[PDB]
């Protein structure tokens, strides 16, 4: 299991999609055509704040790396686009890119 990171919220042109961006030491880091080592989790149904279900995906990058990038708005944005295209390159989905990072929430509970 990987530890909670932040929670990106975006639609999918069919539904609400949260990308639970988590982290774990097991995953290799990349720094110190650019790609980033990250798992691409399996979909799980979670309920939004309203009370209607939606699809969350648990994506995990190198943990030690991650605490470095959670301070850089730039790195931040760079990882989220990538992962979104991982969920697209594996499930189609055609996620919306007008995504928001939740201020409060860091997950939609179900790490694995």
């Amino acid at each position: 299991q990987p530890k909670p990171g932040f929670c990106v919220k975006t639609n999918s042109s069919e539904g609400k999609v949260f990308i639970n961006i988590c982290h774990s030491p097991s995953i290799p880091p990349p720094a110190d055509g650019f790609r980033i080592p990250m798992s691409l989790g399996e979909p799980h149904a979670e309920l939004d704040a309203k009370g209607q279900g939606c699809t969350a995906y648990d994506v995990a990058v190198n943990s030690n790396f991650y605490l470095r990038m959670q301070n850089s708005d730039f790195l931040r944005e760079l990882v989220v686009t990538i992962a979104r295209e991982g969920l697209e390159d594996k499930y189609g989905l055609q996620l919306n890119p007008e995504w928001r990072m939740l201020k409060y929430r860091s997950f939609l509970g179900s790490i694995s």
Binding site: K9, D48, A49, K50, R100, L102, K103, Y104, R105
Partner: peptide, 4 residues
Amino acid sequence: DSDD
């Protein structure tokens, strides 16, 4: 935001 609606969810937060």
